[PDB]
Amino acid sequence: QCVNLRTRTQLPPAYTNSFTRGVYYPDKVFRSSVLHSTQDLFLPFFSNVTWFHAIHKRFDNPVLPFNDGVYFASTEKSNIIRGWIFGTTLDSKTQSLLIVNNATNVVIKVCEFQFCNDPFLGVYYHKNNKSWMESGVYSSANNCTFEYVSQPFLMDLEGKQGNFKNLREFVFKNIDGYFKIYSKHTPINLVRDLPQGFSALEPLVDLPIGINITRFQTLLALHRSSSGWTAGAAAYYVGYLQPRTFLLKYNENGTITDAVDC
Amino acid sequence: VTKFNGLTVLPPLLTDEMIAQY
Amino acid sequence: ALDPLSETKCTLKSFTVEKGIYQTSNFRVQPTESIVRFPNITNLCPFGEVFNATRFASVYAWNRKRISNCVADYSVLYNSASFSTFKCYGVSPTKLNDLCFTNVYADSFVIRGDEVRQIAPGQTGKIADYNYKLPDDFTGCVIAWNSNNLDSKVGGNYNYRYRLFRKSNLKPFERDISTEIYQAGSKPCNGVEGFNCYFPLQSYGFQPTNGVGYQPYRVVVLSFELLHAPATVCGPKKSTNLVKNKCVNFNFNGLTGTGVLTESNKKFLPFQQFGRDIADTTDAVRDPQTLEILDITPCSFGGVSVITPGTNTSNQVAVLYQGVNCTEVNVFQTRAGCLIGAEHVNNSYECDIPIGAGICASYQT
């Protein structure tokens, strides 16, 4: 709660190249067998993305900015990222947006959350009968102003052996108070922690929040057989949206198959 | 060799089959 | 506007028409109906839980139920048929279903019949000042239901109480459930009742033998709040069925215009509503209630042309609607349009009056 994770060590600002990632449908319009231009916020192609590692003391969990929206690309098998934090102060001072995934329903709220100094969504006391079951990211909250729950679902939080075969990419954008979110989940054959190719992130949900946000924080999943906890092997990336112009090649079925940065 | 805002395309007087006869 | 021949003379501004073909006007199918669609209006908030609660909270501790993130059907205010007095201020009850709001509350309490008048904007009284004040800008409603047979007890129902004294009047929608001893004179009360000191709370005299002015009345105030924030709860929207193969207007959840709806093989994703062509013009839409993809073919139109010989020859004249099939209608369809007033012949002659697509006209015996 008050004591930070002793196994936490900040890595240097490493990065790699992102060839054609960060593409998403900027609207809910259908167009097929055409090529549409548009000026909105996207990821510039062949740009750098901040790499972050999570393993027992190489464990990164900083509070990064959100001045213009960001990206995520989680190379994971047990869903190390179970939620996020968004806001300005990220404490009980101002309104703070919180997102949590309990593997059954995505909970979204906006309250004066009394977040811990080193928040998490981990577990502990797994001496026997782990079963990937839960066993306190914030101390308390009140004066809430928003509440939302996604549909029922099931997420595979269980760890798996071998090469990474799953990849999730998201976008987080505040469109005039509407905190729009995109997402995509596809299989992969990992080679260098970031497979290449092309894809498009579909919109997930519209959130009429209307709260200014300037920073964020990731909620990594910890485990222990608050301070002396451990974490499994995982890694993710971070990007930043920029106001670039793009072309969008739609197929006959309306799916984006390619793009070009102007 | 290869809409509704008042725009309309009129056809030609001579069709392609009539041109070939000439 | 007598005959198409006269439209030609008014077009050319001449009382004599030479041989040829001339344009006069523009045909256009006007709309006959209109379609209004909107997603399903289910998932209603349970207003009956408050208006018909099994038990009501006391007056000094009035209960409030927040209404948000649903479809607020306000027809229960009148259609319930379970009230004695029903009044609204500012907005009529029949229009609340069309108005969207940021927050809505249901303030319930049980007060005497004579105290029902005190539930009003800007009104003062024992209940308005010390128990539940309303603002001057109240644009909600109030419903009082006589509960003489339900919330009454012989000798007085002690479960329903109110505040009779307080050092300072309350604010609009403010609750005060304290037990501070009120001071009347210059003497200190010392936290106990005595000379010029009274208890602030008092029980009601609700009994089954009470009059119309003293019996209990289950009062519920539906408070509205239209703030700068985006609306979070709105009422059910009006809609109707679908009209196909007919020139009609469109009022969809996020699309408007005029045209004709037809079934098609197109497909919209679950996160897509309406399509667009190369020119940013809509040509497809998905129904917000049913699972179907419908192309929007606009209403027909085209220039009107008249085919006449010279005025010195005859006044018999044909008419051509360029670029449309025979709908309104001696009729013959062409690849340029529907021609009326001319008889087709299997013979071939020299082209006198051209029409289009190799077809030509003439006046012969």
Author numbering:
A (entry chain D): 14 to 69, 77 to 155, 158 to 247, 255 to 291
B (entry chain D): 826 to 827, 854 to 873
C (entry chain C): 292 to 620, 641 to 676
Question: What's in the article?
Answer:
The spike (S) protein of SARS-CoV-2 is a glycoprotein that forms trimers protruding from the virion surface and mediates viral entry into cells. The S trimer uses its receptor-binding domain (RBD) to bind with the host-cell receptor ACE2, followed by a substantial structural rearrangement to fuse the viral membrane with the host-cell membrane. The Delta variant harbors multiple mutations in S protein, including two substitutions (L452R and T478K) in the RBD, the D614G substitution, a cluster of mutations in the N-terminal domain (NTD), and two more substitutions near the furin cleavage site and in the heptad repeat 1 (HR1). Here we present cryo-EM structures revealing two conformational states of Delta spike and S/ACE2 complex in four states.
To uncover the structural mechanism underlying the observed binding property changes, we carried out cryo-EM study on the Delta S trimer in complex with human ACE2 peptidase domain (PD) domain. In the C2a/C2b/C3 maps, other than the stably associated ACE2 in RBD-1, densities of other associated ACE2s appear weaker. In mode 2, a noticeable outward movement of RBD-1-ACE2 leads to an upwards tilt of RBD-2 to the up position, associated with a downward/outward tilt of the contacting NTD-1; in the meanwhile, RBD-3 moves towards RBD-2, disturbing the original contact with the neighboring NTD-2. This motion depicts the transformation from the S-ACE2-C1 to C2a state with RBD-2 gradually opened. Moreover, mode 3 shows that with an ACE2 binding induced swing motion of RBD-1-ACE2 in an angular range of 12.2° along the NTD-1 to NTD-3 direction, the original contact between RBD-2 and RBD-3 is disturbed, leading to simultaneous upwards tilting of RBD-2 and RBD-3. This motion reveals the transition from S-ACE2-C2a to the all-RBD-up C3 state.
